[PDB]
Amino acid sequence: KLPPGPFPLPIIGNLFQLELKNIPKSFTRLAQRFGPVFTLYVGSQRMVVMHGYKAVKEALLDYKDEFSGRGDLPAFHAHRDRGIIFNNGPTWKDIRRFSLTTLRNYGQGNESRIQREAHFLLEALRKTQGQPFDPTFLIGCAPCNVIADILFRKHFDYNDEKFLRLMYLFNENFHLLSTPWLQLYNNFPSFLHYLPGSHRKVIKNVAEVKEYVSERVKEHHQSLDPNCPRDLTDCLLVEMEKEKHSAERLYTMDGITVTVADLFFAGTETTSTTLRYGLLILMKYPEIEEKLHEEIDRVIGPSRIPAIKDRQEMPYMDAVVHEIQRFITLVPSNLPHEATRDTIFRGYLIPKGTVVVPTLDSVLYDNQEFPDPEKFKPEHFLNENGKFKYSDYFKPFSTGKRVCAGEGLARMELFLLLCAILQHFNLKPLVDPKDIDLSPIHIGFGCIPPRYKLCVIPRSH
Ligand code: HEM
């Protein structure tokens, strides 16, 4: 039979068992009642939820081909079954694989690219002149430009209009997709798609991001030189000129825009948010910032640009960089998976096409691995001798068949960037540390941090 679960109602299914402002909290609640694997009908879509590390691991790692489907996500129909993030189609495996190699090869690697970005990041910060600013569209430019170098060999000035416009759309999409109305819509799309509302803005934003990618792509083709891949959208293009004679093609001008649109969005927004969350966290705990400042100076000093080698001798920072990703559970319910095959899991039948949800928050806040998981504590990642302590539970990028395609870059960005920033600036907040409320203001697709301002105070002059 199916995993156990509350008894669904006609039409709405299990919707009264779900707080829409906070699906993950409902999941945790249902997990107290029914254990680590359970069934939910939301609207008429059947859903199995895995909660806790044993169940989440097994699902992601033991059943790595039965659960490598991508659950549907209506707001993103313009990407469905193409690109990487949202194809559940035939076409995902190789587009993904190829995309992975290409990033590795552009990884003049990832450390220079990031390091060179840092120079413009630090400049923009200098330019705020210790006045109050909203960092959301200052610090975001940096992962935006890095992904944009790989993708288009393009580099944007920190206030070129289309630049700001792109980031803005990424940011609105991640925000909106974390709101109640978008959770309902994503599960009741036919009932709700032609009513007014928030879903339309997301759809219009998705389309707009595609148009801008689309053009960059037509432009790349119209001056393509197969001896010279200038970037990643080149390498995909080349891969399409190869197989033009074949009856089975898996590359489409539309497919390539999706692929790139995907990498652009994902490569910009999760990293931006995490950094922006970090700055708010470090500002709540001035003593943690302080320990950080003295460690940078000791190991790197006020001048020399940070570099990945510096990590293995910076155990506090490495602990902090991880604890920020653990504490915030940025994509708390993972992205949805679905069953490719009628599957048996702990003796339960999971019917093909069942959406499968390997919960990440429930792993990152394991009471056992991370005593006081609700509290931000770098020692969650320090052994009793002050050294870095790794955890099998550090899973904010998921794992297995659909693991983030960007994990390496992401992790490199968080450490070098958070290193740069702190090397040159003191963070300072416009309210007491005592008063910063770290709670996300929406929870769905993502965990979204409160809007805030800060000042950055130079350390070198
Ligand atoms: C802190 C930053 C990031 C976090 C927390 C994050 C997290 C995730 C998560 C949870 C998933 C879905 C996992 C699954 O389905 O099993 C994912 C998928 C993905 N990520 Fe990220 N990601 C981040 C940064 C990036 C970056 C920088 C890129 C681009 C270089 C990227 C590209 C993707 C893509 C294309 C997928 C789709 C996976 C697939 O279906 O094949 N992500 N990421």
Curated annotation (Swiss-Prot):
Binding residue positions for heme: C404
Record PROSITE patterns: CYTOCHROME_P450
Catalytic activity field: an organic molecule + reduced [NADPH--hemoprotein reductase] + O2 = an alcohol + oxidized [NADPH--hemoprotein reductase] + H2O + H(+); (5Z,8Z,11Z)-eicosatrienoate + reduced [NADPH--hemoprotein reductase] + O2 = 19-hydroxy-(5Z,8Z,11Z)-eicosatrienoate + oxidized [NADPH--hemoprotein reductase] + H2O + H(+); (5Z,8Z,11Z,14Z,17Z)-eicosapentaenoate + reduced [NADPH--hemoprotein reductase] + O2 = 19-hydroxy-(5Z,8Z,11Z,14Z,17Z)-eicosapentaenoate + oxidized [NADPH--hemoprotein reductase] + H2O + H(+); (4Z,7Z,10Z,13Z,16Z,19Z)-docosahexaenoate + reduced [NADPH--hemoprotein reductase] + O2 = 21-hydroxy-(4Z,7Z,10Z,13Z,16Z,19Z)-docosahexaenoate + oxidized [NADPH--hemoprotein reductase] + H2O + H(+)
GO cellular component terms listed in the entry, alphabetical order: cytoplasm; endoplasmic reticulum membrane; intracellular membrane-bounded organelle; mitochondrial inner membrane
One Pfam family recorded for the sequence: p450
Residues binding substrate, per UniProt: F265, A266, G267, T268, E269, T270
Regulation (activators, inhibitors): The omega-1 hydroxylase activity is stimulated by cytochrome b5.
GO term, biological process aspect, one: long-chain fatty acid metabolic process
The UniProt record lists the keyword Aminoacyl-tRNA synthetase: no
Protein localization: Endoplasmic reticulum membrane; Microsome membrane; Mitochondrion inner membrane
Effect of V356I: In allele CYP2E1*3
Cofactor names: heme
Domain of life of the native organism: Eukaryota
EC number(s) given by UniProt: 1.14.14.1, 1.14.13.n7
Gene3D superfamilies to which the protein is assigned, alphabetical: Cytochrome P450 (1.10.630.10)
Keyword field: Endoplasmic reticulum, Fatty acid metabolism, Heme, Iron, Lipid metabolism, Membrane, Metal-binding, Microsome, Mitochondrion, Mitochondrion inner membrane, Monooxygenase, NADP, Oxidoreductase
Membrane topology note: Peripheral membrane protein
Signals that turn on the gene: By ethanol and isoniazid.
UniProt keyword Mitochondrion, yes or no: yes
Family listed: Belongs to the cytochrome P450 family.
Role description: A cytochrome P450 monooxygenase involved in the metabolism of fatty acids. Mechanistically, uses molecular oxygen inserting one oxygen atom into a substrate, and reducing the second into a water molecule, with two electrons provided by NADPH via cytochrome P450 reductase (NADPH--hemoprotein reductase). Catalyzes the hydroxylation of carbon-hydrogen bonds. Hydroxylates fatty acids specifically at the omega-1 position displaying the highest catalytic activity for saturated fatty acids. May be involved in the oxidative metabolism of xenobiotics.
Subunit structure: Interacts with chaperones HSP70 and HSP90; this interaction is required for initial targeting to mitochondria.
Descriptive protein name: Cytochrome P450 2E1
Organism: Homo sapiens (Human)
